[PDB]
Structures are given as structure tokens and as C-alpha cells.
Amino acid sequence: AIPTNFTISVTTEILPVSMTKTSVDCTMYICGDSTECSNLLLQYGSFCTQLNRALTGIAVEQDKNTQEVFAQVKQIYKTPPIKDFGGFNFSQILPDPSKPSKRSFIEDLLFNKVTAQKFNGLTVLPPLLTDEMIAQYTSALLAGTITSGWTFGAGAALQIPFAMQMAYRFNGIGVTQNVLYENQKLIANQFNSAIGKIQDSLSSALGKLQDVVNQNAQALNTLVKQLSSNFGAISSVLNDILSRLDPPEAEVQIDRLITGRLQSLQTYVTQQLIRAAEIRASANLAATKMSECVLGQSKRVDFCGKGYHLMSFPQSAPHGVVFLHVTYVPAQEKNFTTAPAICHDGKAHFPREGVFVSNGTHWFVTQRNFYEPQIITTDNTFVSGNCDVVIGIVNNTVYDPLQPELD
Amino acid sequence: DVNCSNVFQTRAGCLIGAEHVNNSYECDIPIGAGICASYQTSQSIIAYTMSLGAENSVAYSNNSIAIPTNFTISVTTEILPVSMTKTSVDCTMYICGDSTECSNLLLQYGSFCT
Amino acid sequence: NTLVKQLSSNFGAISSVLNDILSRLDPPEAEVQIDRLITGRLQSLQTYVTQQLIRAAEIRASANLAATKMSECVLGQSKRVDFCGKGYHLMSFPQSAPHGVVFLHVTYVPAQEKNFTTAPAICHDGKAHFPREGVFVSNGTHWFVTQRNFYEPQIITTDNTFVSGNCDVVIGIVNNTVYDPLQPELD
Amino acid sequence: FYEPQIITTDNTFVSGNCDVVIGIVNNTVYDPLQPELD
């Protein structure tokens, strides 16, 4: 069965990059407006030193994730002013000048879908790359593939038209170059129609990036409820214990309130260090799709989308990255009659890299990618022994273009 | 989170001791909100916006291709860890020592040492 | 060094030495002081082992990436771009290092480049000659074909290209007379 | 695998002269394009 028709499909992969950075004050969340609470904290000051270096280690780790994913090139590339590409359309992935931000229409659509703590010492650290600096690196990668393909992130910039660039991508999967020229209008309409289906689908999934924010805000609201629990005492207020009880008979209750909060903070930091490993593993995995699928054409099966990958289009996303791969999946099939080899006057003719198919009254030769009925000549078949050693071989004449030239 | 010589109020906070300039250089010491500080021009600590690299426009057409001619050979260096050290910690030796009643209370937490 | 300071801490008691408390008080009344010292040390030991298990997962995860560079970059030519350094990788030379490993990759980065007029197809006697692995170039009047990474002027021959239909099937296509070295051999 | 073949002109290609190559031997090519035209 040889496919005789192909189509263009665009998939969607959601890979997280970083998350929100928090900072829990180890000296403010425990005590408050008391004097004797700071004296007992000095005995457990070694515990805050371990928790402070662990929380700061997660903050400095998220900044390194953005420098390894959204920082592959060192030169800022801009989009060409000429909107000529050969029937194809490119306007959704390019930043719109009418918008107040430097993002494209696709990045603004994904931002609409993605939809009080400092009073006790829970501040939020600001990220490094803002919403305007991430869009600059994404715009340079989209403008570099349309002008260089893959000769821009690992060497000098090399200009190349888009008409001849697409023909260099089918050679890695097996499709010949004559299919692009003879069917240029067909691919131009299927590529533009595939963008409209993804645009209308994302405007009406995206639950991977939203789940990360819900898990971070869930642990923040848990520590707020810990200030109301007595932890096996009678009150959770430092000013209430010293009021109803004398300071000589109050050290046995304040120590339980400080110890009860150390177990809650130790559990919080422990869970943040475990969740940081999943974010770090996802950041290193997203960097692989950026330097292989986007930068170049990877020949790995089921890696840059479901099907034969040709080109990628990375898009910006809040605390993540959205990829738009271009898969190549054939359609339909036709049954024929294959044959291992063809014998003529005792010579076993072997094909170069295809397979013989039969119309029914005649024999032909084509590839396993597209059905191309060609005349079996000597330029595609070569001898490599006799026909007696090959088990199971048919008999058919072989055309020789050299014979009519000599006459 | 403090609202605000050399007073500068940015999105990251309020740095007292840096003069704002109209130029733009590469990031050196990270501060926050895409702002980095350094020690340049006489030279003093100044605050400015970080640079994302040299902005250049790539020439694109429809009938011209760039073909290289000369090639060079470069050697890089990557550092990847393999393993670390191995340290064993004892239970009774670290907690207790030359005491008798110290080992009696440890029997209740003997499963934790295992 | 953190576990050493735990032996000198009191953890909300009166002393840190086990031999100092038993020398000043009685065991029936010293049970409330030793319990606070053991509890203060069990939390430090539990936190120490917890931090070691987290670092062990990072070393185990980094070992799979370090072993990948040995079997892909060193052993054989890795076809994965942007994986064995920066550029077209050829061969590597691994080196030993204390508590680590140092690799020496050999990349291939272009230097100078020029610009020439290209042509996606060449029409001769009504046949569209398509290149196999080369790219058509020009110098203003003549037309040549070179490679995608190295510049080598070569004449237009029939043994490097192939015909595929007529010329009315392409939007942008010029015309050029093919030399065809097979023609002088038959005359 | 070991698959011996006859030194022909269709399996090789010319590239400059012989003085540019440091190490190069000398051997007469069979040239199968001559018996086909005769």
C-alpha cells in the first residue's frame, strides 16, 4: 500500500517552564509583637538558616530555567517587511503593531484563558524576564526560521527563500522535491487552513499551566490557617497567653506554639523542594524541544509531534511555553502487487531505495512515500549477481536508454 | 516593597545609591524586574535596563541564498557532575555517648534509627 | 558543619552536654531535660537525611544525562543538533575529572559567506530539471550548482539533476541551456 | 560487509589534479564507458 495523498496537521504541546517565587519569613511568621518569643527563637535559629537557604535556592533556580529555554540565540532578529512567501500566510505568529505589547495575536489569545499574603511575611519575588522581554526572544526565533531555517542558532546567518527551504525538509523523511513544485497551491491552502482550526479551538487543553498556579496558591492558603490552630494549647495568640497567665508560668505554652509552627514550616519547605524537581525536569525537557524541534529538523519518531515533523513555531505563555509543530501524516492508500527483484537475461536488478509496484498490465518503480509511476530503466536498477541465488524473483524485461542513443 | 541621594523607584523596588542613565548595556548583577546594575561610567554604581543582544535585521528576498566558503574549527568545554561523597551518620554515637539513661529513651525511637 | 553545632545547642533547655546535666541533677528529675535534647537532635538528623535524598535524586538525574553524552557524542556521530556543544558536532574526547567529567567537543561553525542568485528550477527543452542534493547558483550571467555548506562552482550536467514533467508546472522558473556532456560523447 | 566491486568511472568522480593530494596511489581505471559506445 502506497499513499497517494497527504495533508497538513498542527498539534499542540504544553510544557511548563517556571512558576511563582515565594519567600517565607522564618522570623516573622513564628513570633509577632512579643519580647519573650525572640529569646526562645535563638535556640532554634539553626533551623531557620537551613530553611532560608532552601527557599532562596528555589528562587535562583527558576531564573536559570528561563535562561536555558528562552535564550538560545544571542542576536535579536526582526521580521522582514516583505509579506511575500509563496502563497503561505504569516500574520498570526508575528507581533501586531496595533497592540500595546510586543506580542502576537496567538500569545494574546492564550493569555486571556490563563486567569493580602504579605501581612504575615509572605512576599512574592519578582521574576527576571518580564512579559516584554520573553516576547523578544520568541519573535527572533520565528523570524529566523522563515529567513534561515536552521542556519542561525549555531553559526553565521544564511539567507534562503521560503520556496527552496520547504523542499529541503521533505528530503529528510523520504518525499521527493517534485511534489512541492507540482503541488504548491495545495500545500499553501492546507497550511493556512490548519492555523484557523487551531486559532478557533484555543479561543473556546490549557489546564497544565493553570494547575501549577493552583498548586502554588494552595500551599500559601494552608499556612494562613495554621495561625488559628492552638497546636494542643488553649490560645493561638502570643498576647493572649501572657495576659491570662503570668510570664513565669507561660514558657511552657509559648514553646509549644513555636514548635508547632516549625513542623508546619518544615513540611512546607520540604514539599517545595520536591515540587522544584518536577519543574526542573520539565524545564530541561522543554529546552530539548527548543533546541531540536525548533532549531533544525529532528528525525526522532514521536518526539516533535505525532507524525513526521517539518517545522516548529514556539509561542510565549505565562510560566510555560506552547509549541505548534507541523506534522506530516499521509492519507488513503491503494493496493498493488510488489515484487522482490526483477530478472532479465540472467541479471538480478536491484533498486536504489524504492519498491516495484504493478499497474496490472505493466511494471513500474516508485518510493514508499508517494506513488510515482516511472519507467523501470537502468538508472534506477543495478546488477549485483545472478538470478539463481535469489529465492523468489519474477522475470521481466528492463528498458535501456543507451540502446536508442547508439542507433 | 518600599515606595519611594540617588533615589530611584522601579518596579522591582527602590534602590538608594544608584543614578538612572538613558543608556542600555548588558546585564551584570541581577536585581529584579529585568533590571541589572553594574559599575561603569568616574565609574559608579548606576541603574539601567538590561540588553537582550545586538538587534540586527536579516535581509530576506526570494531569489538569493547565502553559501559559506571558509570554515573554522572550534572546541568547547562542558562540565557535568557524576557523583558526590559518601558520609555515614550513626544514631547512638551522635546523640548519646558515655551515658546510661540516654540509651533508655532511645529505645522508644529505635525504629527511626533503622 | 551544621550537625556539629547541634551538639552545642540547648533546644530550649539549660545545658547541651549530657555529662553536665547528670552531674548537677538526679536522673528522676533529669528525664525532662534529656527528652528535649533528643527531640531537638532527631529533627536535625531527619532534616539531614531528607536533604541528602533530594541531592541524591539530582545526581541520579544528572548521571543519565552525563551517560548520554558518552554514548551519543563520544560513541558515534550524534545527529542531534545543539546537543553536543554548539554547531555540527563531529567527534569528542572525554577527560577524567575529580567528582565530575570534562568533555571536549569538536564543532563545525561557518565563517565567511557570500550571496548569489539562486534558481529553484532550470528549464531546457521543456523539461524541469530538479537538483538532487545541490543548489543552483549564479554570478550574473552564468549558472552553476554547489552544495548547501561549501561553495564549489560546477557546470550544469545531466548526471546531477533529473527531469520531472514539463516547465508549465512551476510558478518561478528561469531558462538555461544544459551543457549535457553525453551529447559530445555520441557525436 | 565485504562486497568487492570493479573500479569504474560511475562510482568515482574527478576533483582537481593529483598533485594537490599528499597521499595518493596510481592505478589505471577500467572505464566501462568505452566498451558501451563501441
Full 3-state SS string of chain A? CECCEEEEEECCEEEECCCCEEEECCCCCCCCCCCHHHHHHCCCHHHHHHHHHHHHHHHHHHHHHHHHHCCCCCEEECCCCCCCCCCCCCCCCCECCCCCCCCEHHHHHHHHHCCCCCCCCEEEECCCCCCCCHHHHHHHHHHHHHHHCCCCCCCCCCCCCHHHHHHHHHCCCCCCCHHHHHCHHHHHHHHHHHHHHHHHHHCCCCHHHHHHHHHHHHHHHHHHHCCCCCCCCCCCCHHHHHHHCCHHHCHHHHHHHHHHHHHHHHHHHHHHHHHHHHHHHHHHHHHHHHHHHHCCCCCCCCCCCCCEECCCCCEEECCEEEECCEEEEEECCECCCCECCEECCCCEEEECCCEEEECCCCEEEECCCCCCCECCCCCCEEECCCCCCCCCCEECCCCCCHHHHHC
Cα(A307)–Cα(A329) distance, integer angstroms: 6
Q: How close C170 comes to chain A (CA, Å)?
A: 6
Please give the angle made by the CA atoms of A222, A225 and A229, to the nearest 5 degrees.
130
Q: Which residues of C touch B84 (CB under 8 A)?
A: 55, 59, 99
CB contact set of A210 (below 8 Å; sequence gap of 6+) = A114, A115
Does the beta-carbon distance from B61 to A118 stay under 8 Å? no
DSSP state of C105: B
Q: Which three cell numbers mark C176?
A: 538555461
Q: How close A247 comes to chain C (CA, Å)?
A: 16
Q: How close D7 comes to chain C (CA, Å)?
A: 19
Tell which residue, B49, B50, B47, has the closest CA to residue B4. B47
Q: How many CA atoms lie within 13 A of A337 on its CB side?
A: 7
Nearest beta carbon to residue C2 from set A46, A161, A171: A46
Angle between helices A251-289 and A45-69 (to 10 degrees): 20
Q: Which residues of C touch D37 (CB under 8 A)?
A: 185-186
Q: Which residues of A touch C79 (CB under 8 A)?
A: 299
Q: Which residues of A touch B15 (CB under 8 A)?
A: none
Does the beta-carbon distance from B1 to A143 stay under 8 Å? no
The CA dihedral of D26, D28, D29, D35, to the nearest 10 degrees, is: 170
Nearest chain C residue to D33 by CA: give it. Answer: C185
The CA dihedral of A77, A83, A86, A91, to the nearest 10 degrees, is: 80
Burial tier of B87 (Cβ tally within 10 Å: 0-12, 13-18, 19+): exposed
DSSP state of B109: G
Does the beta-carbon distance from A168 to C148 stay under 8 Å? yes
| φ, ψ (nearest 5 deg) of residue C135 | -130, 130
Give the 3-state secondary structure of residue B94.
Answer: helix
Tell which residue, A262, A106, A328, has the closest CA to residue A195. A106
Give the 3-state secondary structure of residue B33.
Answer: coil
Tell which residue, B81, A25, A382, has the closest CA to residue D6. A382
Nearest beta carbon to residue A295 from set C82, C120, C148: C82
Beta strand C113-117 with C106-110 is unpaired
Distance between first and last Cα of chain B? 47
Does the beta-carbon distance from B60 to A137 stay under 8 Å? no
Q: How many CA atoms lie within 13 A of A319 on its CB side?
A: 21
Does the beta-carbon distance from B58 to A157 stay under 8 Å? yes
Tell me the torsion sign for CA atoms B10, B16, B19, B24: negative
Q: Which residues of C touch D33 (CB under 8 A)?
A: 185
Q: Which amino acid is at A344?
A: H
CB contact D14 to C (< 8 Å): no
Does the beta-carbon distance from A80 to B12 stay under 8 Å? no
Give how far Cα B107 sits from Cα of B103, C27, C114, Å. 7, 17, 81
Cα(A144)–Cα(A167) distance, integer angstroms: 17
A341-345, long-range: CB < 8 A, 24+ apart: A341/A387, A341/A390, A341/A393, A341/A394, A342/A376, A342/A381, A342/A393, A342/A394, A342/A395, A342/A396, A342/A398, A343/A387, A343/A390, A343/A393, A343/A394, A343/A395, A343/A396, A344/A395, A344/A396, A344/A397, A344/A398
Residues A10/A307, Cβ–Cβ less than 8 Å? no
Give the 3-state secondary structure of residue C95.
Answer: strand
| φ, ψ (nearest 5 deg) of residue A314 | -70, 140
Residues C122/C176, Cβ–Cβ less than 8 Å? yes
Please give the angle made by the CA atoms of B97, B103 and B106, to the nearest 5 degrees.
120
DSSP state of C72: I
CB contact B1 to C (< 8 Å): no
CB contact A350 to C (< 8 Å): no
Beta strand A342-343 with A394-395 is parallel
Nearest chain B residue to C35 by CA: give it. Answer: B105
Interface of A with B in 162-221 (CB under 8 A): 162-164
A121: alpha, beta or left? (left if phi > 0; alpha if psi -120 to 50): left
CB contact set of A331 (below 8 Å; sequence gap of 6+) = A3, A5, A6, A7
Nearest beta carbon to residue C146 from set B67, B75, B76: B67
List, in sequence order, every residue forming a beta bridge with C150; answer none if it has no partner.
Answer: none
Give how far Cα B20 sits from Cα of A133, B30, B38, B39, B52, Å. 20, 16, 12, 13, 19
Beta strand C113-117 with B64-68 is antiparallel
Tell which residue, A319, A213, A222, A211, has the closest CA to residue A24. A222
Which stretches does DSSP call E strand in chain C? Answer: 95-97, 100-103, 106-110, 113-117, 122-123, 128-131, 135-138, 143-146, 161-163, 174-175
Give the 3-state secondary structure of residue B107.
Answer: helix
- By what technique were these coordinates determined? cryo-EM
Q: Which amino acid is at A285?
A: L
Distance between first and last Cα of chain D? 35
Q: Which three cell numbers mark C163?
A: 527531469
Residues C111/B98, Cβ–Cβ less than 8 Å? no
Q: How many CA atoms lie within 13 A of A329 on its CB side?
A: 11
Nearest beta carbon to residue B95 from set C41, C62, C69: C41
Other beta carbons within 10 Å of A53: 9
Cα(A259)–Cα(A255) distance, integer angstroms: 6
Give the residue carrying C-alpha cell 520539565.
A282
Nearest beta carbon to residue B83 from set C99, C104, C135: C99
Q: How many CB pairs under 8 A join A and B?
A: 80
Give the residue carrying C-alpha cell 512579559.
A131
List, in sequence order, every residue forming a beta bridge with C130; answer none if it has no partner.
Answer: C162
C141: alpha, beta or left? (left if phi > 0; alpha if psi -120 to 50): alpha
Tell which residue, C52, C90, C54, C129, has the closest CA to residue A277. C54
Cα(A70)–Cα(A321) distance, integer angstroms: 9
List, in sequence order, every residue forming a beta bridge with B26; answer none if it has no partner.
Answer: B51
C/A Cβ contact: 3+ pairs below 8 Å: yes
**DSSP H/E element including C22:** helix C18-24
Tell which residue, C131, C121, C132, has the closest CA to residue C170. C121
A126: alpha, beta or left? (left if phi > 0; alpha if psi -120 to 50): beta
CB contact D18 to C (< 8 Å): no
Q: Which three cell numbers mark A391?
A: 529465492
Tell which residue, C115, C25, C100, has the closest CA to residue C59. C100
Does the beta-carbon distance from A125 to B63 stay under 8 Å? no
Tell me the torsion sign for CA atoms A38, A42, A48, A52: positive
Does the beta-carbon distance from A277 to C54 stay under 8 Å? yes
Tell which residue, B16, B9, B8, B15, has the closest CA to residue B30. B15
Cα(C21)–Cα(C34) distance, integer angstroms: 8
Q: How close A50 comes to chain C (CA, Å)?
A: 9
Cα(C11)–Cα(C158) distance, integer angstroms: 89
Residues A279/A66, Cβ–Cβ less than 8 Å? no
Q: Which amino acid is at A187?
A: I
Share in percent of chain B as helix, strand, coil (round to 5) = 15, 40, 45
Residues A168/C132, Cβ–Cβ less than 8 Å? no
Q: Which residues of B touch C113 (CB under 8 A)?
A: 66-69
Residues A176/A170, Cβ–Cβ less than 8 Å? yes
Q: How close C24 comes to chain B (CA, Å)?
A: 14
Does the beta-carbon distance from B80 to C69 stay under 8 Å? yes
Please give the angle made by the CA atoms of A238, A244 and A245, to the nearest 5 degrees.
85
Other beta carbons within 10 Å of C73: 24
